Design a protein around this motif. Structure first.
Motif, short mmCIF file in Angstrom:
data_model
loop_
_atom_site.label_atom_id
_atom_site.label_comp_id
_atom_site.label_asym_id
_atom_site.label_seq_id
_atom_site.Cartn_x
_atom_site.Cartn_y
_atom_site.Cartn_z
N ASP A 145 0.83 -1.20 0.00
CA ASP A 145 0.00 0.00 0.00
C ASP A 145 0.86 1.25 0.00
N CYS A 146 1.99 1.17 0.70
CA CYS A 146 2.91 2.29 0.83
C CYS A 146 3.79 2.58 -0.39
N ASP A 147 4.33 1.53 -1.01
CA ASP A 147 5.19 1.70 -2.18
C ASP A 147 4.40 1.81 -3.48
N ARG A 148 3.08 1.68 -3.37
CA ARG A 148 2.19 1.78 -4.52
C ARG A 148 2.13 3.23 -5.02
N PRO A 149 2.54 3.48 -6.28
CA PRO A 149 2.52 4.84 -6.84
C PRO A 149 1.19 5.54 -6.51
N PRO A 150 1.25 6.82 -6.10
CA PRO A 150 0.08 7.61 -5.73
C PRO A 150 -0.95 8.01 -6.78
N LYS A 151 -2.17 8.24 -6.29
CA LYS A 151 -3.30 8.71 -7.08
C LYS A 151 -3.86 9.83 -6.20
N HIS A 152 -3.42 11.06 -6.47
CA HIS A 152 -3.80 12.24 -5.71
C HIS A 152 -4.35 13.36 -6.59
N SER A 153 -5.59 13.76 -6.31
CA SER A 153 -6.26 14.82 -7.06
C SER A 153 -5.91 16.23 -6.57
N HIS A 175 -5.55 7.66 -3.57
CA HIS A 175 -4.79 6.87 -2.62
C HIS A 175 -3.39 7.43 -2.69
N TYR A 176 -2.84 7.78 -1.54
CA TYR A 176 -1.50 8.35 -1.52
C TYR A 176 -0.91 8.35 -0.13
N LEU A 177 0.22 9.03 0.03
CA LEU A 177 0.90 9.08 1.31
C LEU A 177 0.76 10.42 2.01
N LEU A 178 0.66 10.36 3.33
CA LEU A 178 0.54 11.55 4.16
C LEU A 178 1.75 11.61 5.07
N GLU A 179 2.14 12.82 5.45
CA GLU A 179 3.27 12.98 6.36
C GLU A 179 2.71 13.82 7.50
N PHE A 180 3.14 13.53 8.72
CA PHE A 180 2.69 14.28 9.86
C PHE A 180 3.85 14.30 10.83
N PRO A 181 4.07 15.41 11.52
CA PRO A 181 5.18 15.49 12.47
C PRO A 181 5.08 14.49 13.61
N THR A 182 6.21 13.92 13.98
CA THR A 182 6.26 12.97 15.08
C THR A 182 7.55 13.31 15.84
N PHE A 183 7.54 13.16 17.16
CA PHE A 183 8.70 13.49 17.97
C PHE A 183 9.04 12.33 18.90
N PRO A 184 10.22 12.37 19.52
CA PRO A 184 10.67 11.33 20.44
C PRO A 184 9.75 11.19 21.66
N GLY A 225 9.67 20.06 13.78
CA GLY A 225 10.86 19.24 13.98
C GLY A 225 11.30 18.55 12.71
N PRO A 226 12.29 17.65 12.79
CA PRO A 226 12.79 16.94 11.61
C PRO A 226 12.07 15.66 11.18
N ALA A 227 11.43 14.97 12.11
CA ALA A 227 10.78 13.69 11.82
C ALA A 227 9.30 13.72 11.43
N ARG A 228 8.92 12.76 10.59
CA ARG A 228 7.53 12.67 10.15
C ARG A 228 7.04 11.21 10.14
N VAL A 229 5.79 11.00 10.50
CA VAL A 229 5.28 9.65 10.44
C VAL A 229 4.58 9.62 9.07
N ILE A 230 4.90 8.61 8.27
CA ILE A 230 4.32 8.50 6.94
C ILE A 230 3.32 7.38 6.92
N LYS A 260 -4.85 4.98 6.68
CA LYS A 260 -3.77 5.19 7.63
C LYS A 260 -2.89 3.96 7.92
N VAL A 261 -2.51 3.23 6.88
CA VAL A 261 -1.63 2.09 7.09
C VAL A 261 -0.26 2.72 7.42
N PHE A 262 0.39 2.23 8.47
CA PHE A 262 1.69 2.77 8.84
C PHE A 262 2.76 2.36 7.81
N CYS A 263 3.50 3.34 7.31
CA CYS A 263 4.54 3.10 6.32
C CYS A 263 5.95 3.22 6.91
#
Ligand SMILES: [K+]
Ligand SMILES: [K+]
Length: 149
Positions: free
Chosen positions: A74-82, A91-100, A117-122, A128-131
RNA sequence: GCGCUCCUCAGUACGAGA
RNA sequence: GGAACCGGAGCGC
């Protein structure tokens, strides 16, 4: 699971960019994505939003870019974003900030939004399948690298 | 009226190196 | 990623 990210941070004394190691709990990171709303950059902070991973809206490579391999379908599947990432078949990937510390990023923060910060949960839209957890190589900008775990 | 600052415009238009 | 114009205030002249 424990993920390790390497982020380069500027030293105000030596004025040299130094390596900083950062540990994140996967559970907390997934929790971060669960609590984040399911929209593409329509919050006051603009997070979460679309993580192209080197592709365009039609699922075709961008040429010159190398997509991150998450090791999951699901994660490595090329995106379909309008136009606004709300297509009925999108269907595509989302990024959101995540910290320690794992706290939830204040997505409605604005002027000024909370430091992301520098990190993101993808993760995937819309299930929302964790990538994985990626992080800018240096500072809070530039190239995003896959972290270790 | 000139110069600087802040709010707003607006996370908008624009964009895909975020 | 991410402005400016228009819009409102402050400081100096
Ligand atoms: K301005
Ligand atoms: K103005």
């Amino acid at each position: 699971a424990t993920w390790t990210c390497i982020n380069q941070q500027l030293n105000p004394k030596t004025n040299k960019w130094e390596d900083k190691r950062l540990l994140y709990s996967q559970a907390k990171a997934e929790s971060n994505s669960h609590h984040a709303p399911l929209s593409d950059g329509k919050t006051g902070s603009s997070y979460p939003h679309w993580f192209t991973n080197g592709y365009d809206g039609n699922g075709k490579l961008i040429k010159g870019r190398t997509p991150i391999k998450f090791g999951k379908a699901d994660c490595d599947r090329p995106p379909k974003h309008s136009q606004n990432g709300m297509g009925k078949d999108d269907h595509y990937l989302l990024e959101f900030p995540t910290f320690p510390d794992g706290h939830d990023y204040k997505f409605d923060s604005k002027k000024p939004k909370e430091d992301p910060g520098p990190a993101r949960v993808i993760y995937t839209y819309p299930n929302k399948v964790f990538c994985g957890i990626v992080a800018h190589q240096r500072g809070n900008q530039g190239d995003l690298r896959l972290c270790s775990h």
